[PDB]
Structure 1
Amino acid sequence: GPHMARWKKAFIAVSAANRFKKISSEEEKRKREEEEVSKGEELFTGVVPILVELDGDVNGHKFSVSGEGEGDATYGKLTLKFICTTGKLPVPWPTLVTTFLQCFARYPDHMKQHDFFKSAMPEGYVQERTIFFKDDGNYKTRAEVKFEGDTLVNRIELKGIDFKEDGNILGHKLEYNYNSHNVYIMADKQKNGIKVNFKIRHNIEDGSVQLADHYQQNTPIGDGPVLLPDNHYLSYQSALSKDPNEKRDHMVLLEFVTAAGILTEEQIAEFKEAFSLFDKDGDGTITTKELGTVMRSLGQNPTEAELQDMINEVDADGNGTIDFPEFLTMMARKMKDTDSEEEIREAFRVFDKDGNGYISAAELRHVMTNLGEKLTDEEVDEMIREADIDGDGQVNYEEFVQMMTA
């Protein structure tokens, strides 16, 4: 009847007290994450030296490539030189361009919250691809991109299979050039990373085009937080050239890369019932003294500075006290340390004064009195008798859970 209203008012007040106790740590965690996802981009404000190492095996042709150069994310510019250290490449240099550093993309200011790549640094990320050459074979690559000292290093393994002996790749029919492409990026929340896809068009000497379908996943190497982007794309342009002083099989690569492409009315009255237990003098604001009274009435004993720390997190407008909108906000906040259960379990422990697993009538009477929820002895007995299913005259946790989620 009127009895779950009395349980609910007490439960919300206790929950609000538990949220006051927890709010400073929640806010620290949130600010710490924002600070941590923002540090990686600071590593890219100037020119960054780059090393690249690849070991490859295409149709049983094994080879290795070494690259060096530098990247400048302020301009979205990469300049690299690659040398085949095992002789001549068994595949055309242009088929390896995508495999040979997306942390150097220029992200415009209003998009900087969508730059996964830099946010993963310096610990770095793994980049995995399958590249399907239409009517031909496929590459599978795995790359670790990370800082080693002040140098950004890209270490790559590549495996190619099913290529045709006389196709465009093993027959070396690709022109030594490159076209512009858009690289489409979306968040992969399950893996704390991104999923990427694009199609490369390689010019063939006879005027046709060889398509190369790219599928890509990037996952952070470290355990820290990363930026998970909204859907967007990177605009890529690439130019291939040769070093006229260079005898070994090699490629000079220039890339330019820029990102683009981006309650209940009764609940309010319930909350107001809980708010009045804090606002002892009914003036509509909770002071540190009132909050301290509530905390002590619930078995805590915070210092004046702890109380101030608590009010400071919730005092959104800064007048030094807490009003109902500010109280409302705190209760609407979704916490990163709760399921449905944990709020209920924390509240049950306040009611169960001695922590023996059962709320007795004497305990309920005592906490109600301490909170100032004005109830007679008979009304407390009614609340117990209503929640009590097994008839022991006390409320265990399971009985409490049933009542609160009813």
Structure 2
Amino acid sequence: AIIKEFMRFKVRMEGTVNGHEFEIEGEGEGRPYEGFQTAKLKVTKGGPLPFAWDILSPLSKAYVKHPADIPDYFKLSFPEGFKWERVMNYEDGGVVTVTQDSSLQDGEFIYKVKMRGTNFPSDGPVMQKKTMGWEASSERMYPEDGALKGEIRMRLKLKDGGHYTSEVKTTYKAKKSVQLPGAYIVGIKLDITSHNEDYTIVEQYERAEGRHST
């Protein structure tokens, strides 16, 4: 009963992408049982970023709407919370790795993110900043070795109508022993709703719902 119908969060990220260091702070809010949230981020160090915002945007699992019959691993993990680690392999060789800790403090989610991005080609759409947001995704979740894993083949939209693809694996682990669901899918749609000219301030909006795999 600790995850309320309406919850806020605070986040801090530090990252290095192609050698460029930076820090981001943000806050957000949403409805964890209805499966939606918004966030407002600001680049507090090392901005403007010389690369697409979209590689950062998918870097808040407590807010996925779960059917009654699929255990909500993310919510059951609280108040302790959970960690996750992720690799995102972009098709042109760019790699993003991420570690993250989510906890609950004073009735607010606290997220802490560290990430590194390497090998984004100088001429590619990330460094060229030619992406236009992610298409909707289906994250395949499944229990493996006392943790919960998610795989996603994700696609960033390109200006010219093409797509730029990243193969994503994430391991989710509760900080306390918690019951695992069976395999299932989280449908997710994230959009950037507004930003200043140089993406030093960005607002984004995500909806996510668990569902069975037929």
Q: Per-residue deviation at 1:53? A: 0.7
**Match 1:125 to one of 48, 57, 82:** 82
Secondary structure of the 1:110 match is coil
After superposing the two structures, state which structure 1 stretch, 251-260 or 81-90, moved more.
81-90
SS of the aligned residue for 1:103 comes to helix
Matched, 1:94 2:58: no
Picking from 187, 193, 200, the partner of 2:147 is 193
2:13 matched residue in structure 1: 54
Cross-structure match for 2:207: 256
Residues 142-291 of structure 1 mapped to structure 2, 5 A cutoff? 142-175=99-132, 177-188=133-144, 190=145, 192-221=146-175, 224-242=176-194, 249-261=200-212
d(CA) in 1 for partners of 2:103, 2:50 = 28
Contact kept, 8 Å, 1:184 with 1:196, in 2: the verdict is yes
Q: Is the 8 A contact 1:136 1:167 kept in 2?
A: no
Which residue among 59, 63, 66 is the counterpart of 1:107? 66
Secondary structure of 2:54's aligned partner: helix
Q: Please report how far the alpha carbon of residue 163 of structure 1 lies from its aligned counterpart in structure 2 after TM superposition.
A: 1.5
Distance 1:90 1:227 in 2: 42
Summarize deviations over 1:186-215 as a string: whole Å, max 9, x none: 012x3x321111011101112211001111
Structure with bigger helix share is: 1
Higher strand share: 2
Change (3 A) 1:234 1:80: same
8 A contact 2:142–2:181 mirrored in 1: yes
Return the index of the structure with the highest Cα Rg: 1
Q: Say if 2:134 and 2:154, in contact at 8 Å, map to a contact too.
A: no
Query: Which of the residues 59, 65, 68 maps onto 2:27?
Result: 68
Task: Tell me by how many angstroms 1:90 deviates.
Answer: 2.8
| Identity across matched positions, percent | 22
| 1:298-309 alignment, distance < 5 Å | none
Structure 1: give runs of 5+ residues left out of the alignment. 1-41, 263-406
Match of 2:40 in 1: 81
TM-superposed CA distance for 1:44, in Å, is: 2.2
SS at match of 1:94: helix
Corresponding residue SS for 1:226: coil
Once the 2 structures are TM-superposed, how far is the Cα of residue 241 of structure 1 from its aligned partner?
1.6
Note the residue ranges of structure 2 that are not aligned, 5 or more in a row. none
Please state how far the C-alpha of 1:122 moved relative to its aligned partner: 1.1
Question: Normalized against structure 2, the TM-score is what?
Answer: 0.93
- Are the structure 2 counterparts of residues 150 and 45 from structure 1 closer, same or farther at C-alpha, using a change threshold of 3 Å? closer
Q: Distance in 1 between matches of 2:31 and 2:104?
A: 15
C-alpha distance in 1 between matches for 2:164 and 2:195: 26
Q: Structure 1 residues 152 and 173, CA, compared in 2 at 3 Å: closer, same or farther?
A: same
Note the C-alpha offset of 1:136.
Answer: 2.7
State the one-letter code of the partner of 1:64.
E
Structure 1 residues 113-171: Cα deviation after superposition (integer angstroms, max 9, x where no partner): 2x111111111111100001101310000000111221101100001111211111111
Three-state SS of the structure 1 residue aligned to 2:55 is helix
Distance (Å, rounded) in 2 between the aligned partners of 1:50 and 1:69? 5
Change (3 A) 1:248 1:195: closer
CA contact (8 A) 1:49 1:152 kept: yes
Q: TM-score, normalised by structure 1?
A: 0.50
Q: 1:258 deviation in Å?
A: 0.7
Q: What is the CA–CA distance in structure 1 between the aligned matches of 2:165 and 2:121, rounded to whole Å?
A: 15
Mapped partners of 1:243, 1:135: distance in 2: 27
Cα RMSD of the aligned pairs, angstroms, is 1.7
How far 1:79 moved relative to its partner? Answer: 0.9
